[PDB]
Ligand binder design. Structure first.
Ligand code: HEM
Lengths: 55, 438
């Protein structure tokens, strides 16, 4: 809180972190796609799609 | 300047056409017929090719064995081939063996036995041919290309015909086919090499005078094809070489754009890594392909029929991870026929073609094939002077205008055979038929 209850210090720090967190989130979103790229997307049948790919 | 092609007719309407060459000692005489597989329907598809087998299986006079002996005794050989629009039967011999060869050809065309026993015997031979074309990859690719481009139309059918028809073709339908189609007004007797025209006309009067005339004589090379943008993929991961053909609807023999399409084809040209000169060719596609090892070969083609054609390219490649680049660069070179070609490429291609069209005719069989093809598609032999004038009339504006109406943003027929995993789907191939920057 930066104090003894929710107040000005809390609000100012939440603004700074709220601005930051979406950038961290974009990095992790990119990371999970790079991780996925090794296997590719799964598909609704649950089988391999290596036999039949589309751009 | 080559000797003049002499042309005479008989009363039935059989054309005789000759080009004498006193420097050779052999002669090619034969019969070019304006008829082929395209004249069959779906039920008798395969008949024309079936007949070609039976033509050499014995006549009313000479048996199969006698036929063999008679030709062996002549000294030369006989040859035949059936295409979609054309059938040919010719005999290469010595100068003075020409009357024998005309007599044998007249016999096998008019007086063939088509004996049930021989029909039944060939019915197995032809059935085996169905499982051995499979090896001739270029032919497999071109037959699928016609089948898809002219989907469910007569030009789309194969020459061999389906297995089903081979088992049901009778001597009746064979006889019917050759009676309807092998008429005098559809036939040209051609002689090239050591032939006298006047001698050949006499031999025609002796052997081909009792040929039927058709009821309604149309001119030679008289025909509606509706091209289908489409693809056939014959993926085979075990083959090391991919074979790919891409084509658009091209031009007929008598199109006004016939020479323009030949010039455009020459701008792309051919390439073969096995030929030493090919790395130095002027064609842009050739340079791209050779520098980057994209292909073993490519061959541009412009196939014509009486009422349509196919214009495109046939590629072979072992580079299985860069098929995409090969197709991409090929179609971007086609785009440039619409957007970029100038007098530089056009005049270079014209130079190359003016010679090429003459160079092709380097033996009596080639000359006879040229006279026969031109007589059965155009109704006349076109002199090299006329051909030189028609080529000279092609401008860069003509090429650009032709490519913009024929290639640019048009549907293609595409056939892939072999390890073609890297060949993208239809949309991505067809999207290369235009350039977003233009
Ligand atoms: C900002 C949030 C996220 C974004 C922008 C995002 C984006 C994507 C995209 C574009 C794909 C590939 C296309 C698709 O399958 O829909 C994908 C696949 C995937 N995502 Fe997400 N994602 C996000 C959050 C999450 C979350 C919260 C999870 C798991 C709890 C998740 C797990 C996955 C998995 C397992 C796949 C692979 C699914 C498959 O193709 O079979 N993602 N994501």
């Amino acid at each position: 809180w930066g104090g003894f209850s929710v107040g000005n210090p809390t609000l100012q720090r939440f603004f700074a972190l709220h601005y930051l967190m979406p950038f961290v989130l974009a990095v992790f979103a990119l990371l999970h796609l790079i991780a996925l790229h090794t296997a590719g997307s799964s598909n609704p049948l649950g089988i391999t799609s290596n036999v039949d790919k589309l751009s | 300047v080559s000797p003049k092609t002499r042309t005479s007719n008989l009363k039935n309407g059989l054309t005789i056409a000759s080009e004498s060459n006193p420097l050779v000692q052999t002669a090619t005489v034969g019969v070019w017929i304006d008829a082929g597989s395209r004249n069959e329907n779906a039920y008798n598809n395969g008949t024309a090719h079936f007949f070609e087998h039976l033509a050499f299986k014995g006549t009313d006079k000479r048996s199969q064995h006698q036929l063999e002996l008679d030709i062996e005794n002549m000294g030369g050989h006989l040859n035949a081939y059936t295409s979609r629009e054309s059938t040919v039967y010719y005999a290469k011999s010595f100068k003075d063996d020409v009357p024998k060869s005309v007599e044998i050809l007249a016999d096998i065309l008019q007086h063939s036995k088509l004996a049930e026993s021989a029909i039944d015997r060939e019915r197995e031979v032809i059935t085996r041919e169905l499982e051995e074309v499979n090896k001739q990859y270029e032919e497999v690719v071109f037959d699928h290309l016609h089948a898809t481009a002219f989907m469910n139309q007569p030009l789309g059918r194969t020459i061999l015909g389906p297995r089903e028809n081979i088992q049901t073709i009778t001597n009746t339908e064979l006889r019917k086919f050759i009676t309807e189609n092998y008429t005098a007004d559809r036939m040209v007797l051609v002689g090239a090499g050591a032939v006298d025209h006047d001698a050949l006309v006499e031999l025609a009067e002796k052997y081909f005078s009792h040929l039927p005339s058709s009821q309604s004589p149309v001119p030679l090379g008289t025909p509606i094809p509706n091209f289908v943008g489409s693809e056939v993929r014959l993926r085979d991961d075990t083959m090391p070489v991919a074979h790919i053909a891409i084509a658009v609807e091209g031009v007929s023999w008598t199109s006004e754009d016939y020479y323009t399409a030949l010039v455009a084809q020459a701008i792309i040209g051919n390439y073969d890594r096995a030929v030493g000169t090919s790395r130095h060719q002027g064609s842009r596609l050739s340079n791209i392909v050779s520098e980057n090892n994209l292909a073993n070969s490519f061959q541009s083609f412009s196939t014509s029929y009486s009422d349509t054609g196919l214009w495109g390219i046939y590629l072979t490649s072992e580079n299985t991870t860069q098929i995409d680049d090969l197709v991409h660069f090929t179609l971007k070179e086609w785009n440039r026929l619409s957007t970029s070609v100038s007098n530089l490429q056009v005049e270079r291609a014209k130079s190359q073609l003016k010679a090429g069209l003459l160079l092709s005719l380097d033996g009596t069989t080639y000359v006879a094939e040229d006279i026969g093809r031109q007589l059965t598609t155009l109704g006349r032999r076109v002199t090299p002077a006329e051909v030189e004038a028609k080529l000279e009339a092609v401008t860069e504006h003509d090429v650009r205008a032709w490519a913009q109406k024929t290639l640019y943003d048009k549907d293609i027929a595409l056939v892939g055979l072999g390890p073609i995993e890297g060949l993208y789907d239809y949309n991505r191939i067809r999207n290369d038929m235009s350039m977003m920057r233009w």
